[PDB]
Amino acid sequence: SKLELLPAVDVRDGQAVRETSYGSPLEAALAWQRSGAEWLHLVDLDAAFGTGDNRALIAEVAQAMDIKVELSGGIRDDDTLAAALATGCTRVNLGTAALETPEWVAKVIAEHGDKIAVGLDVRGTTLRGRGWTRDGGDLYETLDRLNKEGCARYVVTDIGPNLELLKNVCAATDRPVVASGGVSSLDDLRAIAGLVPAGVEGAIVGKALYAKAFTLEEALEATS
């Protein structure tokens, strides 16, 4: 299979953002869909950063989509997960919660299966979170724990792309790995697509698309 592309819409104060605002999240999502997106990666930055939420707006965006949706941002307990899942999204990403409440993450993996993917933010070989605990310990300890809890998928962010980290995570698991962040060129996407046989399934791309560095049409061509 070819590398999956997940164009992102990152939502802050009701807007698709980078500092720079790109206006309506709904319009942005529909534009990716019209340009051939198979996935939308929709992020609540306010919920992720603890400065409120965009829950109702994100629900509206998700409802408008006919393509697969991946939701992330502040999904840290039963009620926030319930709302997220009620969008009919294909899956959600849990980040901070994996670090802070490993028992809750284990529970929701058992209940929801591959509706759950776990986001791993790696500085070197240690993990980092957006909550109160800054140090999340050794990457490989957490991968082993989540592997054995039945975690269906990992989303991996370094700290263009850290191809060595991606391959190292692929070595440590038989679950699909999704690359996130550090894509700034079509050549970065080609390099990541070279890791598909190793177990990289997809790449999330935000910044470079809004900046008009490359178009989603160019991106899909490059990974075809």
* Dihedral class, residue 181 (left if φ above 0, else alpha if ψ from -120 to 50, else beta): left
**What phi and psi, each to the nearest 5 degrees, are found at residue 74?**
70, 25
Catalytic annotation present for 46: no
In DSSP notation, the chain reads -PPEEEEEEEEETTEEB---B---HHHHHHHHHHTT-SEEEEEEHHHHHTS---HHHHHHHHHH-SSEEEEESS--SHHHHHHHHHTT-SEEEE-HHHHH-HHHHHHHHHHHGGGEEEEEEEETTEE--SSS-----BHHHHHHHHHHTT---EEEEE----HHHHHHHHHT-SS-EEEES---SHHHHHHHHTTGGGTEEEEEE-HHHHTTSS-HHHHHHHH-
For the chain, give every domain's residue range.
1-224
Please tell me the experimental approach by which this structure was elucidated.
X-ray
Question: Exactly one of 46, 53, 121, 158 is catalytic; which is it?
Answer: 121
Is 121 in the active site? yes
Q: In this structure, are residues 170 and 178 in contact, taking their beta carbons and an 8 Å threshold?
A: no
User: Which pair of structure tokens corresponds to residue 90?
Assistant: 């294909």
Cα 194 to the chain's mean position, in Å?
A: 20
Phi, psi at 20, each rounded to 5°: -75, 130
Contact between 84 and 91 (Cβ < 8 Å): no
In this structure, whether the domain defined by 1-224 belongs to CATH 3.30.450.90 is answered with no
Which entry of 10, 44, 158, 188 is annotated as an active-site residue? 10
